[PDB]
Amino acid sequence: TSPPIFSKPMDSNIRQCRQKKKRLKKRIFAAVSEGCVEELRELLQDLQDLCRRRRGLDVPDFLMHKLTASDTGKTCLMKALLNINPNTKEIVRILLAFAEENDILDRFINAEYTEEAYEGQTALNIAIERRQGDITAVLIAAGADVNAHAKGVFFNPKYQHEGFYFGETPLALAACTNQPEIVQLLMENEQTDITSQDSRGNNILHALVTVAEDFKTQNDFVKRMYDMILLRSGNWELETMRNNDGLTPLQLAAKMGKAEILKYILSREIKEKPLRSLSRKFTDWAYGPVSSSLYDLTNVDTTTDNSVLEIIVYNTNIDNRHEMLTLEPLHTLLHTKWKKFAKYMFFLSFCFYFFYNITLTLVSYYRPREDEDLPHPLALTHKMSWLQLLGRMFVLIWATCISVKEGIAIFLLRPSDLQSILSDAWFHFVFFVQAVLVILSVFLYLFAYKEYLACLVLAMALGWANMLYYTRGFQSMGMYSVMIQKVILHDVLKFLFVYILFLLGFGVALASLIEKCSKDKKDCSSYGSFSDAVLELFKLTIGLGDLNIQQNSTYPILFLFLLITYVILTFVLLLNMLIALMGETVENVSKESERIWRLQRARTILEFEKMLPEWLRSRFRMGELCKVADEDFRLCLRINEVKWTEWKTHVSFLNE
Amino acid sequence: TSPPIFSKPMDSNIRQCRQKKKRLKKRIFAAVSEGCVEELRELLQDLQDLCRRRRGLDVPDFLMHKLTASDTGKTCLMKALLNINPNTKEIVRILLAFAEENDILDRFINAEYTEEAYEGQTALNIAIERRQGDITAVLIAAGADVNAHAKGVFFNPKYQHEGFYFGETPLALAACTNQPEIVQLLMENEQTDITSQDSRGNNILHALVTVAEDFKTQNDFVKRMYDMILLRSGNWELETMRNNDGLTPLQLAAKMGKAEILKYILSREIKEKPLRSLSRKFTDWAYGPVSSSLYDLTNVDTTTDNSVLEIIVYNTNIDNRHEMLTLEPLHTLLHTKWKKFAKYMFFLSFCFYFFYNITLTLVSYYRPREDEDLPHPLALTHKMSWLQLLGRMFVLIWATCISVKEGIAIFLLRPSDLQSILSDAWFHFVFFVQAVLVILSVFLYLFAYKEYLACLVLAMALGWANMLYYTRGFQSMGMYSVMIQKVILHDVLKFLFVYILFLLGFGVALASLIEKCSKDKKDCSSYGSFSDAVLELFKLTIGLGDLNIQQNSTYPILFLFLLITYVILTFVLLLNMLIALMGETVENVSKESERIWRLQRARTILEFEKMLPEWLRSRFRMGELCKVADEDFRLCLRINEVKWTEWKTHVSFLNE
Amino acid sequence: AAKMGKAEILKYILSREIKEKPLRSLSRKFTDWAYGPVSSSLYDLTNVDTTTDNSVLEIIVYNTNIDNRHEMLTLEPLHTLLHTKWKKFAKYMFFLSFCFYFFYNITLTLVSYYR
Ligand SMILES: CCCCCCCC/C=C\CCCCCCCC(=O)O[C@@H](COC(=O)CCCCCCCCCCCCCCC)COP(=O)([O-])OCC[N+](C)(C)C
Ligand SMILES: CCCCCCCC/C=C\CCCCCCCC(=O)O[C@@H](COC(=O)CCCCCCCCCCCCCCC)COP(=O)([O-])OCC[N+](C)(C)C
Ligand code: NA
């Protein structure tokens, strides 16, 4: 979006527009940047000769105070590794030779910035970045600590952009930057503690998830370097370590939205002998096209919180969702729930809520409308032993079940779901106000304010408008509720803005040309008030009003000019762009409507699972226990899938 | 669609979560799976030493009872050929060495499952599947019967998916799996009986049809392996053997819908000397572009039942039909019938049925409408010697010819044709009810119930609506009847569902705001009843009613709010999506309308052929007799086709 | 280059960097530090900004017969120097015109309609 702002840059080439201490520092920092090799041995010989004319037991502290910048913590060796020259291999040798003779060596190698913006960045981070593996091998031989954590403002941005975040450790920098050979050069060195956490709490595997691309692209160098480090560890320690916000690297993969690393993590099978337990897919038999598989689902099903099925559905800012739902343990565990408990509970809602409106409509439409007997037609009003009184009791007790439950569902809703049609925020607002106006019509009848009938008529209106919610069961009618809502909130709300300006504008312009015919008693014009003349232009938009242009008004030609100017501007011009602008939109819905429906069916599957007791939820608890190795008890989900179109491709290529 | 369910898997690697007999069996079945070669010779030496401490003449039965699983019939050698190792070549030698010393050998080789799900699967089937031709040559040298039929639940699925079906024989498994070299290795072995039938009755050639793809694709390994086996046989025995359901492999090719094998089978020409009779296309002379050909049509024309011209037209679930009709003996034998008997009989129906409605309309419209003389205007009612009485007799006798014949055509109609526009199921339902209401109007006039005129008016309505059927003769008007029926049953029936909810909803909502003006005697509102207020909203949809909003009703502002809320919801919003959703549909018809018309003309060609006597059908019997070889009498169809655009391509490449 | 409309030579002339020793001054783009993806740059803008007449930002906007304009506005010293002006003085002055001219018509309409 917008570029960031950093105060001091990391290394500057351009000069911007005591002295003996100023004489000697800058001549070292400049000469190390172009790499004059003779100039290094001149200054450093005089520098140790300078420090002899200084108090002992404070001579190493004065020595580094020459070598260091004052405002930033950068030393001499850091600028050398930044500014690459052919003369680097000589001056690195001398800067290691000068550190040997004194006690400065351990202080010199592990130097970091003390600057607030770039803190912690050691010399070993700089050698890895510039594609210099051989200076990196010497700094390891010099004894640089490989657990160096560079916590800083620049190394921890608050957004995705405005910074660079890799994991604050030299092993994560090696793997994110497409550098294979440095990784085994660091991992086979036994002093490297792999399992260690940064300021965010991430280990090595969380970082590689955050540097991927969700699209399937040409090269996937964050995917293969994820794999090389995992097998070399050979344990479940890197997989199940959980960060500060309580996510594992599979649960983080669904959170960020990376839809290609996540396809790998489900479908791992390693079939060699010592590396057997790392697999999450187990194939037990195959025969031609047919193959059976046992998926793991230890953290996929909803038996625990923050499951990777719950994260995909209920969370937006995940841009691509439907490409994640079509994965194999995710597609089956929605479809297997649909045939067992979920298709009947959606049917029982449509039976009661359609029998709720028939009981509401007949009560209001056949009510006593005479003043001599005006009961409330609901809630019995009296004691008459009237027929069908299992109905009027049924309206009121179901009106509280809708009011309270959606009133809970209003509150427990994040601000992310308010701004998208993909989320069902809009239906909890329309079912709720239908429950309010019913119980208010009993509440306003009782206190005798006597506006009760207006709220009950609006209750019968929205009571049949919300029957369009239950069309999301079919596929042929499920697209027709989505395609309406992609037309209203996109385009039609841009139409009713501009059309008001032409309605408001000519509304006063025609009202000012008449003198009041209510003084004339004839009511000759229908354009008397502003509220009348606006209405007579609305009938001229649909085609309902009549051009009674024989008019006893001041300047009747100008009154006839503006009516023709109105019809050209808004009947042929604006209303036939709205057909031409909806035509772009409806074709853009029809290609991708089948994806949006399967999401909005997969939201009411997981809601009806949460409305279950614990025994009945565990009655439909899918999966069995398995023993796939020595000392192992895992969960399984047998899928006997068959692949005709893929098997013919594999067997055809093998001969030729 | 949905995956299948099988009880016991074929071979399991994963353990699920007397003892001396339990001690020795599992140590054989495990050691044969990883292939420790020393462990085999330890157990089998002790096993024959174990059987000596057992009753003689029951020693081989006890021996196999160790080697076999109890619940399934799988033996030791089957798990070896499944679990491929580098140590298979040793343990196959020893398992053949151990079978030699006893009388177990013939029992050991031909072992099958006795399991219900996987019955009949021998060891020779398993060696072919794992791409192991060399173990297959040894098992033939061991003496495995090649006629092994594996009838089973898994080897015979009821659908296309949920199983694997290849033909239940090791020759069909060799050919379906893209394995050329094993085929001649089985066919040149003289013990292989090629002509043999499975549970479905199929021979070798029926199976290869059922494993193809109807699309023309990159590789066609089921097409070439069909050809290699046919010439090596060199006889008409494999072609004309007919299965249990009475189809030949050409008639089965049209039934399943495979449209690429079928193109090959028509156009075969083999021009070598001993292989001459197998061809179905005969070229006698050619000269540049022009070439003449004699097609075979022994089982193509409709002179016998289940002809391959009758199967394509009258049967659906064949997805692609029009790509099959454009083949060369199928395209000519429809077009040659169109110029001889079929274009006149379609003309004679349009002449009579248009002269049937003029006689019907003039009789009803110029009837005696006075009460002083009210005859039935048809069927003479009297004896007056009235003029033009060759007309009223003509209506009634033709009304029975329509009623009975379509009433036969109602019954003899499969449930497959009821669910598609491609089938003419809908026209037999509308011509039939037009014949009923005419003969009922004479039947209801006679018994003096006196509702006769209502049925006769509906008879005049559908009598001109069915004249849209006879537009299928032209091409310019033939698309316009198809494009109507792809708009009604797709989209408009989804419109009249949602529009009812907005009509039903505001119908009660506006009816509840008025007190009954029939008590006021003025009839001031047109919104009195529910049946009135729904009608006044229907006129506001087209543009016919008038917004008489000056209304003496309770809360007149809310009555004015809902009318504007109705017009926005359904005149600008819903009715202009229906134009925008028909626009997707009509362009999707216009590209493929020319294909759907040629099918619906090719249905009334074969119907008018069935309405012929035997002499007049044999009068137009196409084709002559031929003698294309020694002792041969076949049918022929000479086509002198010319190919300019193909001949220029062939002759241009030949120089360069 | 902006006058005639040539939109490919102009992309080169902005983004020249020569890093050899005697040929240093000819560059109009200066890179001072980079680290992985992040890179900083100093553009020249001696004749790009509107501090003088016939600037190459004024020629692109106010002159037609330049067929392709929007491919020229997306260049890097031209895209930033429009967006940086939008957050400092330009978005408020467009807001003050919409406030006065909408309060100009309400004062006009009420005066004529209630006359
Ligand atoms: C498909 C939809 C599009 C079709 C629209 C086609 C365009 C319009 C089509 C037809 C317009 C109607 C023509 C009839 C004229 C009325 C009669 C009349 O009064 O005569 C008057 C002259 O005529 C006028 O000057 C009338 C004033 C406006 C008429 C149109 C002018 C331009 C409209 C806006 C231009 C575009 C604005 C927007 C730009 C995009 C003189 O009257 P009189 O001398 O006093 O005596 C006559 C007696 N009488 C009054 C009883 C008769
Ligand atoms: C191209 C098609 C689209 C264009 C449509 C554009 C939108 C509509 C365009 C124009 C609407 C017509 C305006 C005229 C008002 C009537 C006069 C009146 O009664 O004044 C009343 C105020 O006004 C009202 O409140 C009337 C009630 C509803 C009017 C519209 C409200 C929102 C409609 C639904 C919103 C969207 C719902 C669906 C969401 C998608 C007050 O009356 P009074 O104080 O008692 O005294 C006046 C005396 N008299 C009554 C005799 C006059
Ligand atoms: Na119209």
H, E, C per residue of B165-191? CCCCCHHHHHHHCCCCHHHHHHHCCCC
CA of A503 relative to ligand 2 center, distance in Å: 12
Q: Does residue C19 belong to the interface with chain A, where contact is any CB pair within 8 Å?
A: no
Q: Does residue A531 belong to the interface with chain C, where contact is any CB pair within 8 Å?
A: no
Torsional sign, CA A389, A391, A395, A398:
positive
Residues in chain B: 656
User: Å from A83 to nearest chain B CA?
Assistant: 56
> Of B90, B69, B87, which Cα lies nearest the Cα of B78?
B69
User: Do residue A9 and residue C32 have CB atoms under 8 angstroms apart?
Assistant: yes
Please say whether the beta carbons of A152 and A119 come within 8 A: yes
Alpha helix stretches (DSSP H) within A451-555? 452-465, 478-487, 493-511, 530-542
HEC sequence for A346-388: HHHHHHHHHHHHHHHHHHHHCCCCCCCCCCCCCCCCCCCCCCC
Q: Which ligand is nearest to the CA of A572?
A: 1
Nearest CA to ligand 2 atom 36: B565
Q: Burial code of B183-199, b = ≥16 C-beta within 10 A, e = fewer? A: beebbeeeeeebeebbe
Q: Does residue B505 belong to the interface with chain A, where contact is any CB pair within 8 Å?
A: yes
Q: Does residue C102 belong to the interface with chain A, where contact is any CB pair within 8 Å?
A: no
SS3 A105: helix
- d(CA A588, CA A582) in angstroms, rounded, equals 10
> Of B56, B135, B55, B123, which Cα lies nearest the Cα of B93?
B135
For the purposes of burial, counting CB atoms within 10 Å of the CB of A493, is it exposed (0-12), middle (13-18) or buried (19 or more)? exposed
Please say whether the beta carbons of A138 and A128 come within 8 A: no
SS3 C38: strand
User: Do residue A508 and residue C37 have CB atoms under 8 angstroms apart?
Assistant: no
Please say whether the beta carbons of B415 and B423 come within 8 A: no
- d(CA B278, CA B629) in angstroms, rounded, equals 11
Q: Write the Ramachandran bin of B381: left for phi over 0, alpha for psi from -120 to 50, otherwise beta.
A: left
CA of A532 relative to ligand 2 center, distance in Å: 10
Alpha helix stretches (DSSP H) within C1-115? 9-14, 58-62, 70-73, 76-85, 91-113
Please say whether the beta carbons of A165 and A198 come within 8 A: no
User: Å from A13 to nearest chain C CA?
Assistant: 6
CA of B179 relative to ligand 2 center, distance in Å: 79
> Of B146, B144, B149, B147, which Cα lies nearest the Cα of B120?
B149
Residue type, B80: A
> Of B578, B585, B581, which Cα lies nearest the Cα of B483?
B585
Q: Which residues pair with C38 in a beta bridge?
A: C35
> Of B160, B259, B265, B161, which Cα lies nearest the Cα of B214?
B259
- d(CA B621, CA B506) in angstroms, rounded, equals 67
The pair of three-digit structure tokens given for residue A408, joined into one six-digit string: 């809970």
Residues in chain A: 656
Find the distance separating the first CA and the last CA of chain C, reported in whole Å.
Answer: 59
B572 interaction partners in chain A (CB closer than 8 Å):
492, 575, 578
Q: Cα-Cα-Cα-Cα dihedral of A93, A96, A102, A103, to 10°? A: -170
CA of residue A546 relative to chain centroid, distance: 54
HEC sequence for B402-437: HHHHHHHHHHCCCCCHHHCCCCCCCHHHHHHHHHHH
Ligand 1 neighbourhood includes A565 CB (under 6 angstroms): yes
SS3 B15: strand
CA of A547 relative to ligand 1 center, distance in Å: 13
Helix (H) or strand (E) holding B283: strand B281-287
Q: Which residues pair with C34 in a beta bridge?
A: C39
- d(CA A176, CA A164) in angstroms, rounded, equals 11
Helix (H) or strand (E) holding B634: strand B634-636
Residue type, B456: L
Cα three-residue angle B33-B143-B84, rounded to 5 degrees:
20
- d(CA B312, CA B256) in angstroms, rounded, equals 10
Please say whether the beta carbons of A143 and A106 come within 8 A: yes
Give residues after which chain B gaps, C-N over 2.5 angstroms: 17
- d(CA B144, CA B110) in angstroms, rounded, equals 6
Which residue bears the tokens 């004024």? Answer: C58
User: Å from C37 to nearest chain A CA?
Assistant: 8
For the beta sheet containing A281-287, the strands, ordered from the edge strand earlier in sequence to the opposite edge, are A281-287, A290-295, A638-639
User: Do residue C35 and residue A508 have CB atoms under 8 angstroms apart?
Assistant: no
Query: Which of B502, B541, B550, B557 has most ligand 2 atoms within 8 Å of its beta carbon, as the pocket-test mutant?
Result: B557
Please say whether the beta carbons of A268 and A278 come within 8 A: yes
Torsional sign, CA B319, B323, B328, B334:
positive
- Binding positions of B for Na(+) are 543
Gyration radius from chain A CA atoms? 38
Please say whether the beta carbons of C78 and C57 come within 8 A: yes
Q: Smallest Cβ distance to B11: which of A285, A361, A492?
A: A285
Give the up-direction half-sphere exposure of residue B416: CA atoms within 13 A in the CB hemisphere: 8
Give the up-direction half-sphere exposure of residue A395: CA atoms within 13 A in the CB hemisphere: 27
- d(CA A389, CA A377) in angstroms, rounded, equals 12
Please say whether the beta carbons of B527 and B549 come within 8 A: no
Query: Who contacts A51 (Cβ-Cβ below 8 Å, separation ≥6)?
Result: A59, A62, A63
DSSP for residue B642:
B
- d(CA A234, CA A274) in angstroms, rounded, equals 9
β-pairing, B290-295 vs A638-639, is unpaired
Gyration radius from chain C CA atoms? 21
The pair of three-digit structure tokens given for residue A132, joined into one six-digit string: 């210099």
Give residues after which chain A gaps, C-N over 2.5 angstroms: 17
Residue type, C42: L
Please say whether the beta carbons of B206 and B198 come within 8 A: no
DSSP string, A305-325: TT-TTHHHHH--S-S--HHHH
SS3 A474: coil
The pair of three-digit structure tokens given for residue B33, joined into one six-digit string: 């799976």
- d(CA C21, CA B503) in angstroms, rounded, equals 82
> Rounded to 5, what percent of chain C is helix, strand, coil?
45, 10, 45
Please say whether the beta carbons of B32 and B76 come within 8 A: yes
Please say whether the beta carbons of B345 and B608 come within 8 A: yes
SS3 A503: helix
Query: Who contacts B158 (Cβ-Cβ below 8 Å, separation ≥6)?
Result: none
Strand positions, DSSP E, B79-201? none
- d(CA B148, CA B144) in angstroms, rounded, equals 9
DSSP for residue B611:
S
Q: Does residue C37 belong to the interface with chain A, where contact is any CB pair within 8 Å?
A: yes
- d(CA A507, CA A526) in angstroms, rounded, equals 12
Among C19, C29, C38, the residue to mutate for chain A (most A Cβ within 10 A):
C38
Which residue bears the tokens 């061991």? Answer: B142
Judged by 3 or more CB pairs under 8 A, whether A touches C is: yes
Query: Who contacts B328 (Cβ-Cβ below 8 Å, separation ≥6)?
Result: B266, B267, B293, B295, B639, B641
Please say whether the beta carbons of B414 and B338 come within 8 A: no
Helix (H) or strand (E) holding A638: strand A638-639
Final resolution, Å: 3.9
Which residue bears the tokens 């772009």? Answer: A584
- d(CA A176, CA A167) in angstroms, rounded, equals 9
The pair of three-digit structure tokens given for residue A22, joined into one six-digit string: 């100023």
The verdict on whether residue A163 carries a ligand-binding annotation is: no
Which residue bears the tokens 């530090």? Answer: C33
Q: Which long-range contacts (CB under 8 A, 24 or more apart) does A437-444 make?
A: A437/A462, A438/A360, A438/A395, A438/A399, A439/A396, A439/A399, A439/A400, A439/A403, A441/A376, A441/A378, A442/A376, A442/A378, A442/A379, A442/A396
> How many CB atoms sit inside 10 A of residue A92's CB?
20
- d(CA B304, CA B301) in angstroms, rounded, equals 8
Residues in chain C: 115
